[PDB]
Write a protein that binds this ligand. Structure first.
Ligand code: CA
Ligand code: CA
Ligand code: CA
Ligand code: CA
Ligand code: MG
Ligand code: MG
Ligand code: MG
Ligand code: MG
Ligand code: MN
Ligand code: MN
Ligand code: MN
Ligand code: MN
Lengths: 237, 237, 237, 237
């Protein structure tokens, strides 16, 4: 199977697989059962922001999710990614709906990664910034139900013509270039990701969530990953 | 055939196909017969720098090539790239040898492209910086004889174990992600490229040169392009 | 007197001093009588964007001014700034009202300047980005009637408590650090400025305009510069 | 007195004021007696690199100091700078010699700071990069014995004409613009600083060290701060 590291914005409490009893943000290391979570005051219909950071000095993956004028939610987990991910990866966004649903709309996404050489002390860097997504956005690999171009946005899951979100939908978008996320010979390394999102649901409760993720380069949506598995994992182990 | 825009650092004067009678830099628009050239006082065995810029306001492609403590060479050409290239391209470096030869070693390569939306005034941007090239550089597509990793450099053309450049060699490196180089609905767009290079000629008579180029995404080295055609064109038309 | 290079967004045609008979954008080199203008279809009460660029390879100062979903206005002028400005300058925004008036509200301002050494080929760079202006914005020198903090914006000219712009007002904001704008030993240099602005004219007859300018470091608002002189020049010569 | 936060590269063990018995890097919070140190394998005559980072999510100030091809030294300390520094500061480099001496040469210095608003989720940012220092570097405030321009470098302490370093010398360089280092209303904030240095000593042991520091805007070299106080503190409390 794929190797996954993710920061989840989980809108539905699946307490039977270890979720806390409230919408929450979490850090997922090779399992949908987050290693760490924080309660998230999710706001139906409002545009929010996610900020994710990691560096090789502290080796602490942290995320902050917030809405303008509200208090933020933050989660952190100590993890040495050199022991978890392959050296080269792809980065992406993933989202799902199940019995319950919501729009999983992405309005912007940026990423920056840097590796400073132990031998020369010079750096390699990659940076991308999407503020609009065209109908043919060739530097993204769309998987599942993901589409781009509608109102200039990236819709991770299925939305009908009438603007309503559909259930049992899974969609992901990965940046086309492989990313060198760690290197033994790098003296310092870091990455950061930011995205803005709009989750609206007409249901009695939204589901299932959005995640920023890092995976093997040939990662694909696992079988049976709609709903609570967020398009990320083949099971709930 | 491919669609090619390039800046050439031409170390060998092929006067039968329109080169001036001295080493020169040139702007090539869909032909190896440059639309504009400038004399280039090349310094064999010395590390040089090339800087290439263009923006959609001036629609002028300009390049500056030089070595530390020497006078620079500059060439410029007015051209509306929206009428020349496809909207989506790849960018790369190419070089060749022929009857005569030289090392075509790249020590660093950076690129930044940005497109600002007419409807939102927000920007999409891509940036990469290589200061070292590893043996498995997954974000580069190597073509022909190009290799990475020897001393952390990109060797565009074949170099023997003893360090001696070989003749009849052609090689290119392209960035893995497609690049959105122009857009009708972009109110302002720009790109910039920089690279550092070391052309060594152990017999003091080098050929054929290095180029930065922009092509259709699926471009391959054309048949018949070693030597004076720089790995870019199938003929001298 | 000061040494001023500016891009003006001139909302009021002063034909007795050489303005064209319509709102326009212009390039001003040591005189309020622009060296080049372009017609500007200004949209009162709408948020606009201005983009200014220059580099030492082309030696062309260009500006683009526009509003979302409208056609842009562009103006360009060839000028070697090494022969015009001092090596070290400050950069700023200026605006004025006179007999007639308008809000001259700035919502964002960014600038980037870079100088690449001829001897080392390494670069010095400065970058700042303001997306919000606080009540005590210590990295700005406010001159005249300019204030910061109301709604997080920079109000270059006087606005009353009821929100109504006042006449005979002049104000400027300059970045605190001096900027090295050109250097003889720099092989390549460039700058770029961007700002977003909101000019509201409650009586539909606005004056006088906003400018981005580059001046000697110790520049103050000239005596007699309210109104058509834009806070930049002591007279119309 | 001034308020100081610093990362020290301490080349001389003053065990009588709490230094460990070896050259070391440390984090100094309002006292020369570091809150945390790490042993530093300082290399006489070799060019090294320092990297300093902090963000408001983790609130952990960390530093990595290293030489090419050697193992790095790293030090980290949990500290909420909102409770230590004023909101607006200046940033700088400082160095000293005493009975024993060394060159305290700076070859490059860069800094980046960012503040994202809780109300709009937009960012303010400052970035500067010095790769050469001219004889008249107007965006630096030089204090004490600091000079710029010699071989394009910043010499923090006195160096004689013959290339030899002098004793009892103190010198600092601060960036001219005030920096907004924290803000209550910022949802996320971060800063990073990098510099390259050359410390050479002809003595039986080098002294006293180099520091990156953050202080009140009007900070000046304290009385009696040569030698072990690093030009930072008025005493050893
Ligand atoms: Ca869940
Ligand atoms: Ca040729
Ligand atoms: Ca006017
Ligand atoms: Ca000491
Ligand atoms: Mg958007
Ligand atoms: Mg290199
Ligand atoms: Mg703003
Ligand atoms: Mg230097
Ligand atoms: Mn969960
Ligand atoms: Mn040629
Ligand atoms: Mn005018
Ligand atoms: Mn110490």
């Amino acid at each position: 199977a794929d190797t996954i590291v993710a920061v989840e914005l989980d809108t539905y409490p699946n307490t039977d697989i270890g979720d806390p009893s409230y919408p929450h943000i979490g850090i997922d290391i090779k399992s949908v059962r987050s290693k760490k979570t924080a309660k998230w005051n999710m706001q139906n219909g409002k545009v929010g922001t996610a900020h994710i950071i990691y560096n090789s000095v502290d080796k602490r993956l942290s995320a902050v999710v917030s809405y303008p004028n509200a208090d933020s939610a933050t989660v952190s987990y100590d993890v040495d990614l050199d022991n978890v991910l392959p050296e080269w990866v792809r980065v992406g966004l993933s989202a799902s709906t199940g019995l319950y649903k919501e729009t999983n709309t992405i309005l912007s996404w940026s990423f920056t990664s840097k590796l400073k050489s132990n031998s020369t002390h010079e750096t390699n860097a990659l940076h991308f910034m999407f503020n609009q997504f065209s109908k043919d956005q060739k530097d993204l690999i769309l998987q599942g139900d993901a589409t781009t171009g509608t109102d200039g946005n990236l819709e991770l899951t299925r939305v009908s013509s009438n603007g309503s979100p559909q259930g049992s939908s899974v969609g992901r978008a990965l940046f086309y270039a492989p990313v060198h996320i760690w290197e033994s010979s790098a003296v310092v390394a870091s990455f950061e990701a930011t995205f803005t999102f709009l989750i609206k649901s007409p249901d009695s409760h939204p589901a299932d969530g959005i995640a920023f993720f890092i995976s093997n380069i040939d990662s694909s949506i696992p079988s049976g990953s709609t709903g609570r598995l967020l398009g990320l994992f083949p099971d709930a182990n």
